[PDB]
Design a binder for this molecule. Structure first.
Ligand SMILES: *[C@@H]1O[C@H](CO)[C@@H](O[C@@H]2O[C@H](CO)[C@@H](O[C@@H]3O[C@H](CO[C@H]4O[C@H](CO)[C@@H](O)[C@H](O[C@H]5O[C@H](CO)[C@@H](O)[C@H](O)[C@@H]5O)[C@@H]4O)[C@@H](O)[C@H](O[C@H]4O[C@H](CO)[C@@H](O)[C@H](O)[C@@H]4O[C@H]4O[C@H](CO)[C@@H](O)[C@H](O)[C@@H]4O)[C@@H]3O)[C@H](O)[C@H]2NC(C)=O)[C@H](O)[C@H]1NC(C)=O
Ligand SMILES: *[C@@H]1O[C@H](CO)[C@@H](O[C@@H]2O[C@H](CO)[C@@H](O[C@@H]3O[C@H](CO[C@H]4O[C@H](CO)[C@@H](O)[C@H](O)[C@@H]4O)[C@@H](O)[C@H](O[C@H]4O[C@H](CO)[C@@H](O)[C@H](O)[C@@H]4O[C@H]4O[C@H](CO)[C@@H](O)[C@H](O)[C@@H]4O)[C@@H]3O)[C@H](O)[C@H]2NC(C)=O)[C@H](O)[C@H]1NC(C)=O
Ligand SMILES: *[C@@H]1O[C@H](CO)[C@@H](O[C@@H]2O[C@H](CO)[C@@H](O[C@@H]3O[C@H](CO[C@H]4O[C@H](CO)[C@@H](O)[C@H](O[C@H]5O[C@H](CO)[C@@H](O)[C@H](O)[C@@H]5O)[C@@H]4O)[C@@H](O)[C@H](O[C@H]4O[C@H](CO)[C@@H](O)[C@H](O)[C@@H]4O)[C@@H]3O)[C@H](O)[C@H]2NC(C)=O)[C@H](O)[C@H]1NC(C)=O
Ligand SMILES: *[C@@H]1O[C@H](CO)[C@@H](O[C@@H]2O[C@H](CO)[C@@H](O[C@@H]3O[C@H](CO)[C@@H](O)[C@H](O)[C@@H]3O)[C@H](O)[C@H]2NC(C)=O)[C@H](O)[C@H]1NC(C)=O
Ligand SMILES: [Cu+2]
Lengths: 680, 678, 100, 50, 101, 50
């Protein structure tokens, strides 16, 4: 038995000029797996012709290329779509480019209706979501959470089977027996209790942390990161003023994703992330209970050999790529892809990031190439373990968890691969000169004490709408759709406050950063900062004004810069829209981790951690970064001061720095699977 | 484009007395996945009490054991059932025994209603099917074909997905487009065109023969063989007087299956069946597109290492089980399981067979054991590649866990080829047949002619409504018909004419076998090595008069083949006229006639026929109750039941070998099923 | 047994089994308390996956060290390996015979 | 894992060569777990308590 | 190799027969080693080139100097490049891998 | 002198954690039956005939 989640939603008034767009968007995402002939979009799309409106798109080459590809023929409906499938990738990229360059919202809506009526549902939804996120006239509206747009990618096969059975039966034949199987009929809706994956899917006791790696917020955060910074798009469209920092961002996000993951491994006593060799048997197995269009996801058997003949070519490329980077580390200063690079400069990080993502910015100074290959894509294909026939043949593919950004974080091999990549990047980082005392010491400021309230974690029920997973009848489409709600346990932490005491000789503006990190490693020994600098997670980052004398700063966890609130359901979105309000976090803070995942759980019911507090002078960001003020607090690199290796730890024993030891406890049931009828 | 299969069924009048029973049986098989409170059986099941009716069962120990097991609690509903799961098998065995020892049909019907109301659907359907097959009072009753009882085990995931979508939508939203996705609406029914598995599921070009290994009747034959002779039942209650020939039946059936598979491989140019080492890795990848309760079937990669950390114990057992057998071959005459065994005698075959099946007959002379092990079960577990867990409430299904899907996995063929290799090593002991036993003095086969041998693909329709869950309205009034229309192999009628000379007038037996002529390497196969690859196709008797004789045998009269089963609707239609499909009552355990010949080629594929004429001798007296499966007293597969050592001394005037060619008409491949190809 | 245990001579195997089972159970409890899981199983024809580098000496002679991935079946051990295997298989055969 | 030699006057000590140090080696626990698994396979014969 | 050597009563590392050098823990090191070797072979194909801001011509016997330094990773190899906080030695990595500690 | 072959009492319980480690106790009560006669010299290690 677990308590039910109840929370208040932060709301902001919506611009009256955007009341028409929002609705329209929400109308095109209803039952996107099906086309209803009775809807307006059906007629609009059926009658719309792209070429006749070629003047309504800013760029003309986009229209010509889209027309050429459409004449060549797109993929048929009712098939699995993945951005890693080359032909589908080209088609969806062309469609997205057509969407983005539409001169006005009316043309964009007409094109979206055309795409939904004529094109594959998956490509349509992907491109439409990306365009809504990136279009200028759609800034301010709210989109549904990814787990409500793709429910099948965020639940296991058993719950989906139950939902499909209920839909086919149009209710319960014997309602009294429903509760004994985890199905509750209440308030015109059906609630299905959902578990997490067990030892059948994960080996080596990793299932203990399933609740964390299968959490909807985790995968939704990864998908949001992909959507905001797609690898195939040019940086200028993505980030205008801070394009040169793209690689840095690539390093900052993944470094965080792994670190948190590592922390969870320490909470469950699983140790460090394994390392592997490409030319040796892979020891981590994976048996996902996931399916798309009833097609099972690929299963990787234990001791799978990656260097078979069929994959040999790919392997070679992978190896070569790695080798090349090492050679660059020996050169130090060189020219690659017609770009001059000096590794003694921190700025070079950008290039490094791009190099390991194989994104468009890496090939911006070279003529358009018909030959292109991605290290990440090849590694994902090799580790997916799908049959080679699936790869070779175009009209058939067996889906893998690594072929979608909504399910990549479920596979353990993802973490190992990106840990290898980050190991290479840190080997590069070893070049940079460590920060000196002059830059770390804030003369005149001393932190006297840091106090923290009790840190408690617990599981609570969370409900999310999964109606889009089923196919509806004509009558349901006409009158109203059924409501199938998945109720699952989720991790959460109680509110807590950090109190900091600071003595200042002078009055000035300062920047305060709060980080979280582990204390002991898998072997039970304390971790020195020289190795722990990469494992710290940045929690808070804010400005303050210090007056002469003593000062106290109380910072509530509900105000941390790098975390957001949980997304609201579609019905609540409609309720708020009818009253002219929208959720602020879903508007402009959706690219941040959920606040419920700040703290680890711990299998021993008590886990030690450490908090790091640093205060340094404030300097305003350069003016040109004006339209990015909401996301940049100062001009320092992301992760400062833990952005480069620490060589001499005694430089961090400054008056303006403080390390605190804290303990995280668990309240209630230690495990999340106590959700049966007799346990409730 | 392929022709549509239409053929009238050869029916026979049913005894009026059994009519009612037939009805009831069918009523218990309707929508077995769901329990309808409004049906008649519901009240009986909810009110029936077995203990109070303990006097209604002939045996009391069975009732006590079943009650003791039920006190502990059976498996929950809506869960995967497999006979290879120990606890589920233990429960289902007790349920089947309770069904089998019921005094009369009323008690059996009450018990079946109780089981359906309370127990797991899979266990209930399995036990009821087996009991109806075996119960004497139900003998002569027609049962639906296995592929209509478990449609999800005989079709891939895409077609089932389309069917589920149609069921959820309660029809088509945009009908005029469904045609482009292989979904046709017609005559109050929905037809779904289906493809066979391709290279994505099968590696090393095996998919070329997917039309054969995935054939519905090909797997239904194995399921019927399992049902008729189940490893966990004593010989007396399953076969009766043919209890000492159980191992012979096992060997014969498995050898015939492997021989037909090898013929298909040769026709598709795939070579011989690979051999493997347990301490080495299996080299047969398999990625089934199958699901039960949406739970995916286990997948195995191309290079799978069989000996891992969690399998060692099983591996060890397997190895030991093999080595012991080899030791027996060195001893010759020994005492095992309280039974004296002499390998010099042919009858010992029985023991050998049981030894390789670990059936109950192998342990009938030793005290009841609580330590149970099976070579085949461990081999299937190892080859399935499913994740290993010590929890009884969590399983990942594999094709080898069900007899309905076992033949879809090449590992099955490899494993049983290994087993039959051991059995042939044993067979090397037996003395070869002599001329006096083979030569038919005064009988010579002058000639043998055969008409053109033709194979093709034709559309076949089968009902797949049981795979979906119906609504209350559908249960109360009527459900829609979801029909799967898929290509299937078939052959045109042909006749074999045999011209014989015999001045002596006597009774004789004629056997006809079909076999290969060239191996995978393109060289002819000597009879000393080809004796294990010959498939018996005909076995009959004839009276030869003095002088010349001409025998004309039609392909529709061959002993070892039947006709295709029919859907439930036609069964009801015939029952309304007091008739039943005769071949679903007669010869319903044999292979279909459509699979008699391997698929041919445009140019033609070479094979050979072997015709053998020998003296007739009537089957023994005590063999009277089973005088519908045998024709004489000779062993199954005679004269190829033992190795041929010298082909010179085997050939006789009363034997004939002929070379024939099989041709293909129409499309060579079965995947031309698109809207634009029709 | 007579000179070591006396009247509890027919219960020697019971004592052996009980003592070793208790030792392994206590070790498993400690592993669970330290979050290390169950006791791994190994195959003789495969390699042991338990590294050990003892810091022990007798007469200054170092104790033997074993790496993480040690192949048990090498050129100089075959005979012993064979015996081990046989000794196991015979026992399994006994389980099939029951009374012997 | 000690070096193998046919000479009786030369030995490299191992933890498993002494009962004072046997329990320091995980291989001891693994080996005796295997042995007890065999013994429990034997124990499966016995009739359960009523 | 089973050395009977000890320092401060700490035994020297023992390398068992058939020791596998390419385990995950060492994989990084292995890669570096391999890369180093590969690089040299590439140089042999170039003949005349510039490495570490030093012009090298392999047709001249004098080039031996560079070659030697290249395989020792000594200070003279990096005399023409700015002081590097990143440094790795082929010999040291190979010694670590073969030591089996 | 007495009970010098048994485990020490200090190792009875596995090391715990600050939050607490879960385990269970099983208590069983059954009829008493005295050890056999010839078992007299060893009636310091046993309590019954089970
Ligand atoms: C997420 O994962 C978790 C983890 O698995 C799941 O939690 C499990 O859920 C299942 C099903 O909901 C639970 O099984 C049920 O447990 C019931 C509680 O039983 C307790 O009390 C009884 C005495 O009254 C004890 O016997 C039980 O255990 C003891 O006995 C068993 C006997 O086998 C031993 O094995 C144990 O070691 C104990 O000694 C518990 O202490 C239980 O009542 C219920 O049993 C009914 O159903 C089973 C089905 O097989 C029958 O065998 C049994 O005879 C009972 O008969 C009922 O059957 C059906 C209903 O199913 C109807 O005909 C009637 O209602 C009839 O009464 C069942 O076994 C399991 O305990 C639980 N595990 C936990 C909490 O750890 C979640 O379900 C899962 N969530 C989702 C959404 O998937
Ligand atoms: C069992 O397995 C087999 C083999 O895998 C499979 O057969 C294949 O079926 C697919 C259909 O699912 C076939 O694909 C279609 O082919 C036709 C015919 O193409 C030939 O002829 C044209 C000229 O007429 C040539 O240009 C072409 O190269 C071929 O030689 C096409 O007409 C189809 O094109 C339409 O659909 C495409 C998407 O699939 C679009 O890209 C294309 O533009 C066409 O669009 C049409 O529909 C749109 C949506 O309504 C509409 O907007 C358009 O205006 C237009 O009307 C299609 O490519 C394939 O060829 C078959 N292959 C073989 C070897 O037979 C079976 O289907 C399968 N069975 C089952 C039950 O699964
Ligand atoms: C789980 O998820 C499912 C699916 O997302 C949820 O189901 C959805 O619920 C919402 C809220 O109830 C639905 O939106 C509302 O729909 C009603 C009904 O609309 C229908 O009936 C109208 C007449 O009563 C009819 O006019 C409508 O047709 C018009 O609109 C369509 C386009 O949508 C257009 O093509 C037609 O030509 C018509 O113009 C339609 O047939 C509707 O009345 C609501 O509108 C109000 O709100 C909007 C927005 O504020 C406002 O603009 C309007 O003026 C009006 O005030 C509203 O749109 C949605 O349709 C449901 N989706 C499906 C597929 O059925 C479910 O609620 C979730 N459950 C949870 C979270 O528990
Ligand atoms: C495919 O299979 C389904 C299910 O087996 C078939 O539906 C079944 O059809 C039979 C015959 O029409 C029904 O039995 C009859 O029911 C009527 C009452 O409606 C009764 O008067 C008759 O005496 C007879 O018992 C049966 O109830 C029905 N089952 C369900 C669940 O509806 C279907 O006909 C099959 N289709 C084809 C093409 O074979
Ligand atoms: Cu593993």
């Amino acid at each position: 038995g677990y308590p039910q989640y109840h929370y208040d939603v932060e709301t902001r008034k919506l611009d009256p000029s955007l009341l028409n767009i929002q609705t329209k968007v929400l109308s095109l995402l209803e039952n996107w797996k099906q086309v209803n002939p009775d809807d307006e979009y059906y007629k609009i799309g059926k009658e719309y012709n792209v070429e006749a409106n070629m003047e309504s798109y800013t760029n003309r080459e986009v229209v010509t290329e889209f027309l050429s590809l459409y004449k060549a023929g797109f993929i048929p409906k009712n098939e699995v779509f993945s951005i890693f499938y080359e032909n589908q990738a080209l088609e969806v990229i062309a469609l997205y480019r057509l969407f983005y360059y539409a001169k006005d919202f009316e043309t964009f809506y007409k094109t979206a209706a055309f795409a939904r009526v004529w094109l594959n549902e998956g490509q349509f939804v992907y491109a439409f979501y990306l365009a809504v996120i990136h279009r200028a006239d759609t800034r301010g509206i709210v989109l549904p959470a990814p787990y409500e747009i793709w429910p099948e990618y965020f639940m296991n096969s058993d719950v989906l089977s139950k939902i499909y059975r209920i839909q086919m039966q149009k209710g319960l034949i014997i309602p009294e027996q429903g509760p004994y199987y985890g199905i509750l009929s209440k308030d015109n809706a059906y609630y299905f209790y959902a578990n997490y994956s067990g030892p059948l899917t994960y080996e080596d006791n990793e299932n203990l942390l399933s609740y964390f790696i299968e959490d909807i917020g985790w995968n939704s955060y990864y998908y949001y990161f992909h959507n905001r910074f797609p690898f195939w798009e040019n940086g200028e469209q993505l980030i205008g003023p801070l394009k040169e920092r793209r690689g840095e961002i690539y390093y900052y996000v993944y470094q965080k994703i792994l670190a948190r993951y590592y922390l969870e491994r320490l909470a469950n006593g699983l140790g460090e992330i394994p390392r592997f060799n490409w030319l040796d048997k892979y020891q981590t197995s994976y048996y996902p209970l996931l399916s798309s269009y009833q097609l099972p996801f690929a299963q990787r058997n234990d001791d799978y050999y990656l260097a078979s003949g069929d994959n040999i070519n790919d392997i070679q490329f992978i190896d070569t790529y790695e080798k090349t980077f090492l050679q660059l580390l020996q050169k130090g200063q060189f020219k690659a892809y017609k770009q001059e690079v000096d590794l003694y400069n921190s700025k070079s990080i950008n290039f490094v990031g791009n190099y390991w993502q194989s994104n468009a910015d890496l090939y911006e100074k070279v003529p358009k190439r018909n030959y292109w290959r991605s290290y990440e894509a090849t590694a994902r294909r090799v580790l997916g373990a799908a049959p080679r026939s699936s790869i070779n043949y175009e009209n058939m593919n067996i889906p893998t968890a690594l072929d979608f950004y909504q399910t990549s974080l479920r596979d353990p091999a993802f973490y190992q691969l990106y840990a290898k990549i980050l190991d290479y990047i840190n080997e590069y980082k070893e070049y940079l000169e460590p920060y000196s005392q002059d830059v770390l010491h804030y003369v005149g400021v001393k932190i006297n004490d840091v106090k923290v309230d009790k840190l408690v974690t617990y599981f609570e029920y969370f409900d999310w709408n999964a109606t889009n997973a089923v196919y509806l009848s004509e009558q349901q489409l006409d009158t109203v759709s059924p409501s199938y709600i998945v109720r699952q346990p989720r991790l959460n932490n109680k509110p807590f406050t950090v109190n900091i005491d600071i003595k200042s000789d002078v009055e000035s503006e300062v920047v305060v950063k709060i980080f979280l990190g582990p204390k002991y490693d898998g072997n039970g020994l304390p971790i020195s900062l020289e190795d722990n600098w990469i494992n710290f997670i940045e929690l808070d980052w804010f400005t303050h004004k210090l007056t002469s004398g003593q000062n106290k700063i109380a910072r509530k966890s509900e105000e941390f810069f790098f975390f957001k609130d949980d997304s609201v359901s579609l019905f609540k979105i409609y309720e708020l829209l009818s009253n002219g309000q929208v959720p602020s976090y879903m508007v402009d803070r959706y690219i941040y981790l959920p606040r419920r995942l700040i703290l680890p759980r711990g299998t021993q019911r008590g886990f030690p951690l450490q908090l790091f507090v640093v205060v340094y002078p404030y300097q305003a960001p350069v003016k040109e970064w004006e339209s990015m003020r909401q996301y940049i607090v100062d001009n320092k690199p992301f992760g400062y001061p833990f952005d480069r290796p620490v060589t001499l730890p005694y430089y961090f024993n400054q008056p303006n720095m403080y390390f605190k030891d804290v303990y995280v406890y668990q309240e209630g049931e230690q495990y999340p699977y106590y959700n049966s009828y007799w346990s409730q | 484009g392929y022709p549509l299969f239409n053929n009238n069924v050869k029916t026979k009048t049913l005894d009026p007395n059994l009519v009612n029973i037939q009805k009831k049986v069918l009523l218990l098989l309707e929508n077995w996945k769901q329990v309808d409170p409004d049906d008649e059986y519901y009240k009986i099941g909810k009110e029936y009490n077995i203990e109070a009716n303990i006097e209604s069962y002939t045996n009391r120990e069975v009732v006590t054991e079943f009650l003791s097991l039920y006190k502990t609690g059976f498996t929950a509903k809506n869960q995967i059932f497999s006979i290879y799961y120990e606890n589920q098998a233990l429960e289902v065995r007790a349920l089947y025994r309770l069904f089998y020892y019921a005094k009369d049909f009323e008690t059996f019907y009450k018990t079946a209603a109780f089981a359906r109301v309370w127990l797991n659907e899979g266990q209930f359907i399995y036990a009821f099917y087996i009991a109806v097959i075996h119960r004497a009072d139900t003998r002569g009753i027609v049962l639906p074909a296995p592929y209509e009882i478990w449609p999800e085990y005989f079709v891939n995931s895409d077609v089932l997905a389309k069917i589920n979508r149609i069921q959820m939508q309660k029809g088509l939203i945009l009908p005029e487009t469904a045609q482009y996705y292989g979904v046709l609406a017609k005559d109050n029914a929905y037809y779904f065109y289906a493809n066979y598995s391709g290279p994505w599921t099968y590696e090393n070009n095996e998919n070329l023969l997917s039309y054969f290994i995935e054939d519905v009747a090909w797997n239904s034959y194995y399921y019927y063989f399992h049902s008729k002779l189940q490893f966990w039942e004593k010989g007396e209650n399953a076969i009766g007087p043919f209890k000492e020939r159980r191992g012979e039946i096992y060997y014969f059936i498995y050898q015939q299956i492997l021989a037909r598979y090898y013929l298909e491989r040769l026709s598709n140019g795939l070579g011989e069946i690979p051999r493997f080492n347990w301490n080495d890795r299996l080299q047969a990848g398999y990625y089934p597109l199958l699901t039960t309760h949406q739970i995916p079937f286990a997948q195995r990669n191309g290079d799978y290492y069989l000996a891992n950390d969690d399998n060692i114990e099983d591996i060890q057992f397997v190895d030991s089980y093999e080595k012991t057998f080899l030791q027996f071959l060195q001893k010759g005459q020994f005492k095992a399981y309280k039974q004296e065994v002499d390998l010099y005698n042919s009858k010992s075959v029985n023991f050998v067979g049981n030894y390789w099946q670990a059936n109950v007959d192998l342990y009938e002379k030793v005290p009841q054991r609580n330590y149970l092990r099976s070579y085949e079960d461990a081999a299937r577990r190892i080859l399935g590649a499913a994740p290993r867990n010590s929890y009884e409430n969590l399983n990942v299904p594999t094709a080898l866990d069900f007899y309905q899907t076992s033949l879809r996995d090449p590992a099955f063929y490899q494993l049983y080829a290994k087993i039959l290799d051991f059995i042939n090593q044993y067979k090397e002991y037996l003395e070869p047949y002599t001329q006096d036993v083979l030569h038919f003095v005064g009988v010579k086969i002058n000639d043998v002619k055969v008409d053109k041998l033709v194979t093709y693909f034709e559309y076949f329709d089968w009902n797949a409504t049981n795979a979906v869950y119906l609504s209350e309205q559908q249960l109360d009034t009527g459900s829609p018909s979801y029909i799967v229309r898929q290509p299937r192999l078939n052959n045109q009628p042909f006749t074999v004419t045999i011209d014989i000379k015999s001045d002596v007038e006597s009774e004789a037996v004629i056997k006809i076998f079909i076999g290969p002529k060239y191996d995978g390497n393109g060289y002819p196969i000597d009879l000393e090595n080809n004796w294990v690859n010959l498939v018996e196709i005909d076995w009959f008797t004839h009276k030869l008069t003095s002088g010349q004789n001409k025998i004309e045998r039609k392909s529709e009269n061959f002993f070892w083949f039947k006709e295709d089963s029919v859907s439930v609707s036609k069964i009801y239609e015939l029952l309304n006229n007091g008739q039943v499909p005769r071949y679903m009552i007669e010869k319903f355990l044999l292979l279909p006639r459509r699979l008699l010949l391997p698929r041919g080629t445009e140019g033609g594929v070479p094979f050979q026929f072997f015709v053998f004429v020998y003296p007739y001798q009537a089957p023994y007296k005590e063999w009277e109750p089973m005088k519908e499966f045998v024709v004489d007293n000779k062993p199954f597969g005679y004269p190829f039941d033992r190795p041929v050592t010298e082909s010179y001394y085997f050939t006789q005037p009363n034997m004939y070998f002929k070379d024939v060619y099989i041709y293909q008409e129409g499309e060579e491949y079965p995947y031309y099923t698109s809207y634009w190809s029709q």
